[PDB]
Amino acid sequence: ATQGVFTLPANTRFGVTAFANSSGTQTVNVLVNNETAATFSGQSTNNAVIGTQVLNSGSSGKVQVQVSVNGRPSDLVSAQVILTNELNFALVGSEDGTDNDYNDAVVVINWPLG
Amino acid sequence: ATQGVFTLPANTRFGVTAFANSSGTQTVNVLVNNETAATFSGQSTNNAVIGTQVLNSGSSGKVQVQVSVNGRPSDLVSAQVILTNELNFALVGSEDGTDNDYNDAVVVINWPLG
Amino acid sequence: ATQGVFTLPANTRFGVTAFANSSGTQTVNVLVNNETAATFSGQSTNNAVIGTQVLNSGSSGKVQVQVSVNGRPSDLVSAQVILTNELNFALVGSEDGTDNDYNDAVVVINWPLG
Amino acid sequence: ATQGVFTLPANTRFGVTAFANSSGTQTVNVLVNNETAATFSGQSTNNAVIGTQVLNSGSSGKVQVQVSVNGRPSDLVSAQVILTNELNFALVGSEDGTDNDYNDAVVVINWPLG
Ligand SMILES: [Ca+2]
Ligand SMILES: [Ca+2]
Ligand SMILES: [Ca+2]
Ligand SMILES: [Ca+2]
Ligand SMILES: [Ca+2]
Ligand SMILES: [Ca+2]
Ligand SMILES: [Ca+2]
Ligand SMILES: [Ca+2]
Ligand SMILES: [Cl-]
Ligand SMILES: [Cl-]
Ligand SMILES: [Cl-]
Ligand SMILES: [Cl-]
């Protein structure tokens, strides 16, 4: 099944934040309406916050997260969760290797902001 | 129901990261072993990271997040999500006012690390 | 925080299913258009499906779950989860007692159908 | 990533319930310690409960859900959610066809019982 694609409410500011847990340097691309809007990268085995940004979901509300290590796409897993019918998280894990820890890059999307 | 309390696997390192979206200065306390292990304070209406750290869940595995503003505890909401039976998120929102956006401090806990 | 209230897409059919795990008879009430639209009752400590029904979220999309045990409202906990940006669950737990298992009546809402 | 595999607490009773929303007869297999423990089959486009059963997670706690239609495995999506650090859901969707509604068989696992 497709993973790492989320329909947000249109024209909405959201936070996107990436964490690294791997020997390899991660690259996280964040697309809004099918165009790259942010790119984060770093290397940490201790959950470094390699990037954080505020983006706008735009007219489509379509947000996609892609993860790669030195040109190789990682395997994604994802889901969305809503607390008290108000607070939204879109969650991505990724695996670059064989251990299936799926934390090699972790991406959290949150809205609303403000 | 109790909110912001999570039983992690014992003796396990975890990330805790806090984001602010409020006029109020947010104070986030993270307890392990029922004693404060990290405290983050900051202000933003743009989802700024007001703290990030790695902590150890200790012998009980019990982790608690508390949030207060102007000395008053905020109302918490939380849940845990597990992706591909491996990647864990414990998520907390909080409300310091009337709009019920529950984003006034947002806390992301994630494990495993490494 | 408010629990057991969910904003579904308007005019959408959804399943609602209740399970019982308690010494006491559970009453589950499901509201749409702020009016009770399905009710289920039963006593089980073996996760009986005390009722399942398909309902329509109507023009507001507002769906509410209430649980009580012989008149006394239970304490609710809830969240919503979305898989592959498509499949939706709204989840309710409830506590009628002191043990905080929150399984005394469990309610699952799922959409889309068909 | 692997989907439909969950590590429950060992030797614990859990509920497993399957719903159908498809033109085809759905077959759901529920494995405990890599051996099929329960199987549900049925057809509905109106979210009928095609099976429900209480099972024991046994010494390993490993539970796996597989879904097929007339011998063809469906594509699975899944996650786990925990409310108030107590109530657990393991959630499965499946897609048997081209529309990607992922509701063709929906499987809900819940614990603890009682
Ligand atoms: Ca890995
Ligand atoms: Ca890793
Ligand atoms: Ca607020
Ligand atoms: Ca706010
Ligand atoms: Ca109880
Ligand atoms: Ca109970
Ligand atoms: Ca389908
Ligand atoms: Ca279908
Ligand atoms: Cl909720
Ligand atoms: Cl999973
Ligand atoms: Cl997803
Ligand atoms: Cl919680």
Side-chain angles (χ1 to χ4, degrees), chain A, chain B, chain C residues 1-71 73-114, chain D:
Chain A
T2 297
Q3 294 282 264
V5 177
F6 309 107
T7 306
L8 275 63
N11 299 301
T12 297
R13 294 199 311 154
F14 64 94
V16 55
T17 305
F19 306 87
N21 291 284
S22 179
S23 287
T25 305
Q26 310 291 307
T27 298
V28 174
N29 286 288
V30 183
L31 288 70
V32 175
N33 205 354
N34 301 312
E35 301 293 0
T36 304
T39 306
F40 307 146
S41 185
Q43 186 279 309
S44 176
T45 59
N46 200 42
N47 214 47
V49 194
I50 61 166
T52 189
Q53 201 164 319
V54 174
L55 294 172
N56 190 295
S57 72
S59 65
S60 67
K62 182 181 185 188
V63 181
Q64 177 167 17
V65 172
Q66 306 186 133
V67 183
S68 63
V69 173
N70 202 6
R72 185 181 177 268
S74 296
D75 195 50
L76 305 185
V77 64
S78 62
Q80 176 176 335
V81 181
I82 309 177
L83 306 184
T84 191
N85 199 42
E86 290 278 8
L87 177 66
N88 292 248
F89 299 88
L91 303 175
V92 182
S94 65
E95 180 50 55
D96 68 13
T98 60
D99 71 352
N100 297 336
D101 67 356
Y102 277 86
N103 72 358
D104 293 327
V106 176
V107 185
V108 179
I109 288 167
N110 70 291
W111 75 95
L113 304 186
Chain B
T2 293
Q3 297 282 260
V5 177
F6 312 107
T7 299
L8 272 63
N11 298 305
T12 298
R13 288 169 61 84
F14 67 92
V16 55
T17 300
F19 306 84
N21 292 280
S22 175
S23 293
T25 297
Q26 304 296 308
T27 299
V28 173
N29 276 279
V30 186
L31 292 76
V32 178
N33 314 294
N34 297 302
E35 298 296 323
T36 299
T39 313
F40 309 136
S41 279
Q43 189 278 327
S44 183
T45 50
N46 295 317
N47 209 46
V49 170
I50 61 161
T52 188
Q53 205 166 314
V54 174
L55 297 170
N56 179 322
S57 67
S59 53
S60 69
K62 186 184 181 183
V63 182
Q64 179 160 21
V65 174
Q66 305 173 313
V67 180
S68 61
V69 177
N70 301 324
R72 173 189 168 95
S74 294
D75 191 52
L76 306 184
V77 67
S78 58
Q80 182 177 329
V81 179
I82 311 175
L83 304 184
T84 190
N85 198 39
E86 177 67 11
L87 172 67
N88 291 255
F89 301 84
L91 304 169
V92 183
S94 66
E95 183 48 57
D96 66 20
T98 57
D99 65 354
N100 296 336
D101 63 357
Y102 279 87
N103 75 358
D104 298 324
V106 173
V107 180
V108 176
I109 287 166
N110 66 287
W111 77 96
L113 306 183
Chain C
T2 297
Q3 297 279 261
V5 178
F6 309 108
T7 303
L8 273 61
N11 302 121
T12 299
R13 295 165 71 245
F14 69 91
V16 58
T17 304
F19 305 84
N21 290 284
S22 173
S23 75
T25 301
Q26 304 295 303
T27 307
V28 173
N29 286 314
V30 186
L31 293 73
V32 180
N33 311 302
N34 301 303
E35 310 159 304
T36 305
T39 303
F40 316 125
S41 303
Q43 191 274 314
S44 182
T45 55
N46 301 312
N47 205 52
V49 177
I50 63 166
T52 186
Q53 176 63 267
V54 174
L55 293 175
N56 178 319
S57 69
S59 42
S60 75
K62 189 179 182 199
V63 180
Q64 181 161 13
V65 174
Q66 303 175 331
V67 181
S68 65
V69 174
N70 285 310
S74 299
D75 189 55
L76 307 187
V77 65
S78 61
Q80 297 170 60
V81 59
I82 308 174
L83 306 185
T84 196
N85 200 36
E86 169 68 12
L87 179 64
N88 288 252
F89 301 88
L91 303 166
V92 182
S94 72
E95 182 53 53
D96 66 15
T98 56
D99 73 355
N100 299 333
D101 65 357
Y102 278 88
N103 73 355
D104 298 324
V106 176
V107 184
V108 180
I109 291 169
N110 70 287
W111 79 93
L113 308 190
Chain D
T2 295
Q3 294 285 261
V5 178
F6 310 110
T7 303
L8 272 63
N11 300 302
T12 298
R13 297 200 307 152
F14 65 96
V16 57
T17 303
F19 308 83
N21 291 281
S22 167
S23 75
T25 296
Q26 303 290 306
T27 300
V28 176
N29 302 113
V30 185
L31 291 78
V32 175
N33 213 352
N34 304 312
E35 328 286 356
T36 300
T39 295
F40 307 140
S41 289
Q43 185 277 323
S44 182
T45 47
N46 204 30
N47 211 50
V49 173
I50 62 161
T52 189
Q53 200 164 324
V54 176
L55 292 178
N56 191 298
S57 72
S59 68
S60 72
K62 187 184 175 181
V63 185
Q64 172 163 22
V65 173
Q66 304 179 297
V67 181
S68 61
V69 181
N70 196 49
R72 187 174 171 279
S74 302
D75 191 50
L76 306 180
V77 68
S78 63
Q80 301 168 67
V81 181
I82 309 177
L83 307 181
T84 191
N85 200 39
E86 294 281 3
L87 177 58
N88 293 251
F89 300 87
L91 303 170
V92 184
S94 58
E95 178 53 50
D96 65 13
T98 55
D99 65 355
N100 290 340
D101 62 356
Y102 279 87
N103 77 357
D104 298 317
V106 177
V107 187
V108 172
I109 285 164
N110 68 289
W111 79 91
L113 309 185

PDB file of all heavy atoms in Angstrom, chain B residues 81-100:
ATOM      1  N   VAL B  81       1.144   5.026  19.155  1.00  0.00           N
ATOM      2  CA  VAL B  81       0.959   4.377  17.863  1.00  0.00           C
ATOM      3  C   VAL B  81       2.211   3.582  17.532  1.00  0.00           C
ATOM      4  O   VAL B  81       3.339   4.040  17.743  1.00  0.00           O
ATOM      5  CB  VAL B  81       0.691   5.424  16.749  1.00  0.00           C
ATOM      6  CG1 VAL B  81       0.522   4.793  15.372  1.00  0.00           C
ATOM      7  CG2 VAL B  81      -0.516   6.251  17.081  1.00  0.00           C
ATOM      8  N   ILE B  82       2.010   2.373  17.002  1.00  0.00           N
ATOM      9  CA  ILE B  82       3.122   1.508  16.641  1.00  0.00           C
ATOM     10  C   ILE B  82       2.971   1.188  15.172  1.00  0.00           C
ATOM     11  O   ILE B  82       1.918   0.699  14.760  1.00  0.00           O
ATOM     12  CB  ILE B  82       3.182   0.201  17.481  1.00  0.00           C
ATOM     13  CG1 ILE B  82       3.053   0.508  18.972  1.00  0.00           C
ATOM     14  CG2 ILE B  82       4.465  -0.567  17.161  1.00  0.00           C
ATOM     15  CD1 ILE B  82       2.988  -0.718  19.859  1.00  0.00           C
ATOM     16  N   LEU B  83       4.041   1.452  14.427  1.00  0.00           N
ATOM     17  CA  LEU B  83       4.129   1.127  13.007  1.00  0.00           C
ATOM     18  C   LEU B  83       5.007  -0.101  12.768  1.00  0.00           C
ATOM     19  O   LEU B  83       6.033  -0.231  13.397  1.00  0.00           O
ATOM     20  CB  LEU B  83       4.659   2.340  12.215  1.00  0.00           C
ATOM     21  CG  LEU B  83       3.841   3.633  12.384  1.00  0.00           C
ATOM     22  CD1 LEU B  83       4.456   4.675  11.447  1.00  0.00           C
ATOM     23  CD2 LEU B  83       2.326   3.498  12.191  1.00  0.00           C
ATOM     24  N   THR B  84       4.567  -0.938  11.848  1.00  0.00           N
ATOM     25  CA  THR B  84       5.177  -2.244  11.463  1.00  0.00           C
ATOM     26  C   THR B  84       5.700  -3.014  12.685  1.00  0.00           C
ATOM     27  O   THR B  84       6.780  -3.634  12.669  1.00  0.00           O
ATOM     28  CB  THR B  84       6.156  -2.124  10.262  1.00  0.00           C
ATOM     29  OG1 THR B  84       6.511  -3.431   9.804  1.00  0.00           O
ATOM     30  CG2 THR B  84       7.404  -1.402  10.593  1.00  0.00           C
ATOM     31  N   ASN B  85       4.901  -2.995  13.756  1.00  0.00           N
ATOM     32  CA  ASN B  85       5.200  -3.709  15.011  1.00  0.00           C
ATOM     33  C   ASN B  85       6.571  -3.410  15.592  1.00  0.00           C
ATOM     34  O   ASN B  85       7.144  -4.238  16.284  1.00  0.00           O
ATOM     35  CB  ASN B  85       5.079  -5.223  14.715  1.00  0.00           C
ATOM     36  CG  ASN B  85       4.917  -6.059  15.959  1.00  0.00           C
ATOM     37  OD1 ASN B  85       4.231  -5.669  16.893  1.00  0.00           O
ATOM     38  ND2 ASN B  85       5.493  -7.257  15.951  1.00  0.00           N
ATOM     39  N   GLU B  86       7.089  -2.232  15.304  1.00  0.00           N
ATOM     40  CA  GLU B  86       8.470  -1.886  15.641  1.00  0.00           C
ATOM     41  C   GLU B  86       8.688  -0.446  16.055  1.00  0.00           C
ATOM     42  O   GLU B  86       9.418  -0.208  17.004  1.00  0.00           O
ATOM     43  CB  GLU B  86       9.379  -2.157  14.454  1.00  0.00           C
ATOM     44  CG  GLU B  86      10.806  -1.769  14.659  1.00  0.00           C
ATOM     45  CD  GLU B  86      11.570  -2.562  15.694  1.00  0.00           C
ATOM     46  OE1 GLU B  86      11.086  -3.614  16.181  1.00  0.00           O
ATOM     47  OE2 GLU B  86      12.726  -2.122  16.010  1.00  0.00           O
ATOM     48  N   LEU B  87       8.116   0.497  15.331  1.00  0.00           N
ATOM     49  CA  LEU B  87       8.464   1.895  15.532  1.00  0.00           C
ATOM     50  C   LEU B  87       7.379   2.506  16.378  1.00  0.00           C
ATOM     51  O   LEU B  87       6.218   2.477  15.982  1.00  0.00           O
ATOM     52  CB  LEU B  87       8.560   2.630  14.202  1.00  0.00           C
ATOM     53  CG  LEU B  87       8.726   4.135  14.268  1.00  0.00           C
ATOM     54  CD1 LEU B  87      10.084   4.430  14.866  1.00  0.00           C
ATOM     55  CD2 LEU B  87       8.619   4.740  12.894  1.00  0.00           C
ATOM     56  N   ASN B  88       7.733   3.015  17.559  1.00  0.00           N
ATOM     57  CA  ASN B  88       6.765   3.505  18.533  1.00  0.00           C
ATOM     58  C   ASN B  88       6.730   5.029  18.673  1.00  0.00           C
ATOM     59  O   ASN B  88       7.786   5.698  18.773  1.00  0.00           O
ATOM     60  CB  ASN B  88       7.067   2.944  19.940  1.00  0.00           C
ATOM     61  CG  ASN B  88       6.811   1.477  20.047  1.00  0.00           C
ATOM     62  OD1 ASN B  88       5.812   1.054  20.644  1.00  0.00           O
ATOM     63  ND2 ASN B  88       7.658   0.669  19.409  1.00  0.00           N
ATOM     64  N   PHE B  89       5.525   5.578  18.694  1.00  0.00           N
ATOM     65  CA  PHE B  89       5.332   6.993  19.013  1.00  0.00           C
ATOM     66  C   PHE B  89       4.426   7.128  20.205  1.00  0.00           C
ATOM     67  O   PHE B  89       3.358   6.519  20.223  1.00  0.00           O
ATOM     68  CB  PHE B  89       4.692   7.777  17.886  1.00  0.00           C
ATOM     69  CG  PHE B  89       5.450   7.773  16.591  1.00  0.00           C
ATOM     70  CD1 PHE B  89       5.309   6.740  15.684  1.00  0.00           C
ATOM     71  CD2 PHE B  89       6.290   8.802  16.251  1.00  0.00           C
ATOM     72  CE1 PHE B  89       5.936   6.754  14.435  1.00  0.00           C
ATOM     73  CE2 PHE B  89       6.952   8.801  15.025  1.00  0.00           C
ATOM     74  CZ  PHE B  89       6.796   7.781  14.122  1.00  0.00           C
ATOM     75  N   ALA B  90       4.801   7.937  21.187  1.00  0.00           N
ATOM     76  CA  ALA B  90       3.878   8.367  22.246  1.00  0.00           C
ATOM     77  C   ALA B  90       3.692   9.836  22.042  1.00  0.00           C
ATOM     78  O   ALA B  90       4.679  10.588  21.961  1.00  0.00           O
ATOM     79  CB  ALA B  90       4.447   8.070  23.613  1.00  0.00           C
ATOM     80  N   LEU B  91       2.457  10.236  21.882  1.00  0.00           N
ATOM     81  CA  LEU B  91       2.139  11.584  21.423  1.00  0.00           C
ATOM     82  C   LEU B  91       1.301  12.314  22.456  1.00  0.00           C
ATOM     83  O   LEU B  91       0.368  11.742  22.994  1.00  0.00           O
ATOM     84  CB  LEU B  91       1.344  11.495  20.117  1.00  0.00           C
ATOM     85  CG  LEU B  91       2.028  10.709  19.001  1.00  0.00           C
ATOM     86  CD1 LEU B  91       1.015  10.501  17.910  1.00  0.00           C
ATOM     87  CD2 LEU B  91       3.233  11.460  18.491  1.00  0.00           C
ATOM     88  N   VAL B  92       1.624  13.594  22.681  1.00  0.00           N
ATOM     89  CA  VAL B  92       0.898  14.390  23.612  1.00  0.00           C
ATOM     90  C   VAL B  92       0.562  15.733  22.996  1.00  0.00           C
ATOM     91  O   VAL B  92       1.401  16.375  22.399  1.00  0.00           O
ATOM     92  CB  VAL B  92       1.698  14.661  24.931  1.00  0.00           C
ATOM     93  CG1 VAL B  92       0.915  15.468  26.004  1.00  0.00           C
ATOM     94  CG2 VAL B  92       2.218  13.344  25.507  1.00  0.00           C
ATOM     95  N   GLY B  93      -0.686  16.117  23.158  1.00  0.00           N
ATOM     96  CA  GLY B  93      -1.102  17.493  22.943  1.00  0.00           C
ATOM     97  C   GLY B  93      -1.519  18.104  24.252  1.00  0.00           C
ATOM     98  O   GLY B  93      -1.826  17.404  25.225  1.00  0.00           O
ATOM     99  N   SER B  94      -1.624  19.418  24.225  1.00  0.00           N
ATOM    100  CA  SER B  94      -2.053  20.145  25.414  1.00  0.00           C
ATOM    101  C   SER B  94      -2.778  21.440  25.073  1.00  0.00           C
ATOM    102  O   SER B  94      -2.482  22.084  24.045  1.00  0.00           O
ATOM    103  CB  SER B  94      -0.893  20.387  26.315  1.00  0.00           C
ATOM    104  OG  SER B  94       0.050  21.256  25.738  1.00  0.00           O
ATOM    105  N   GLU B  95      -3.703  21.804  25.969  1.00  0.00           N
ATOM    106  CA  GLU B  95      -4.548  23.005  25.766  1.00  0.00           C
ATOM    107  C   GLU B  95      -4.454  23.908  26.988  1.00  0.00           C
ATOM    108  O   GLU B  95      -4.780  23.492  28.079  1.00  0.00           O
ATOM    109  CB  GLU B  95      -6.017  22.616  25.528  1.00  0.00           C
ATOM    110  CG  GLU B  95      -6.971  23.754  25.236  1.00  0.00           C
ATOM    111  CD  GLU B  95      -6.469  24.725  24.175  1.00  0.00           C
ATOM    112  OE1 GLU B  95      -6.168  24.280  23.000  1.00  0.00           O
ATOM    113  OE2 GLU B  95      -6.377  25.980  24.384  1.00  0.00           O
ATOM    114  N   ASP B  96      -4.024  25.141  26.765  1.00  0.00           N
ATOM    115  CA  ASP B  96      -3.870  26.152  27.802  1.00  0.00           C
ATOM    116  C   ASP B  96      -4.963  27.210  27.793  1.00  0.00           C
ATOM    117  O   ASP B  96      -4.932  28.127  28.617  1.00  0.00           O
ATOM    118  CB  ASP B  96      -2.489  26.806  27.701  1.00  0.00           C
ATOM    119  CG  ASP B  96      -2.302  27.599  26.455  1.00  0.00           C
ATOM    120  OD1 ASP B  96      -3.273  27.978  25.822  1.00  0.00           O
ATOM    121  OD2 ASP B  96      -1.139  27.896  26.111  1.00  0.00           O
ATOM    122  N   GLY B  97      -5.935  27.073  26.897  1.00  0.00           N
ATOM    123  CA  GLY B  97      -6.988  28.095  26.619  1.00  0.00           C
ATOM    124  C   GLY B  97      -8.350  27.557  26.255  1.00  0.00           C
ATOM    125  O   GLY B  97      -8.842  26.634  26.873  1.00  0.00           O
ATOM    126  N   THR B  98      -8.992  28.223  25.308  1.00  0.00           N
ATOM    127  CA  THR B  98     -10.387  27.993  24.918  1.00  0.00           C
ATOM    128  C   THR B  98     -10.591  27.485  23.489  1.00  0.00           C
ATOM    129  O   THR B  98     -11.669  26.947  23.191  1.00  0.00           O
ATOM    130  CB  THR B  98     -11.147  29.333  25.001  1.00  0.00           C
ATOM    131  OG1 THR B  98     -10.521  30.318  24.161  1.00  0.00           O
ATOM    132  CG2 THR B  98     -11.217  29.814  26.456  1.00  0.00           C
ATOM    133  N   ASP B  99      -9.601  27.645  22.600  1.00  0.00           N
ATOM    134  CA  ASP B  99      -9.790  27.284  21.214  1.00  0.00           C
ATOM    135  C   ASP B  99      -9.762  25.766  20.980  1.00  0.00           C
ATOM    136  O   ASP B  99     -10.193  25.329  19.941  1.00  0.00           O
ATOM    137  CB  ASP B  99      -8.834  28.017  20.233  1.00  0.00           C
ATOM    138  CG  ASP B  99      -7.377  27.677  20.425  1.00  0.00           C
ATOM    139  OD1 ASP B  99      -7.026  26.936  21.399  1.00  0.00           O
ATOM    140  OD2 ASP B  99      -6.582  28.174  19.595  1.00  0.00           O
ATOM    141  N   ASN B 100      -9.292  24.988  21.953  1.00  0.00           N
ATOM    142  CA  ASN B 100      -9.188  23.511  21.814  1.00  0.00           C
ATOM    143  C   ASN B 100      -8.440  23.036  20.558  1.00  0.00           C
ATOM    144  O   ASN B 100      -8.791  22.025  19.937  1.00  0.00           O
ATOM    145  CB  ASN B 100     -10.557  22.842  21.893  1.00  0.00           C
ATOM    146  CG  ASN B 100     -11.213  23.018  23.236  1.00  0.00           C
ATOM    147  OD1 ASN B 100     -10.568  23.233  24.265  1.00  0.00           O
ATOM    148  ND2 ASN B 100     -12.523  22.945  23.230  1.00  0.00           N
TER     149      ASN B 100
END
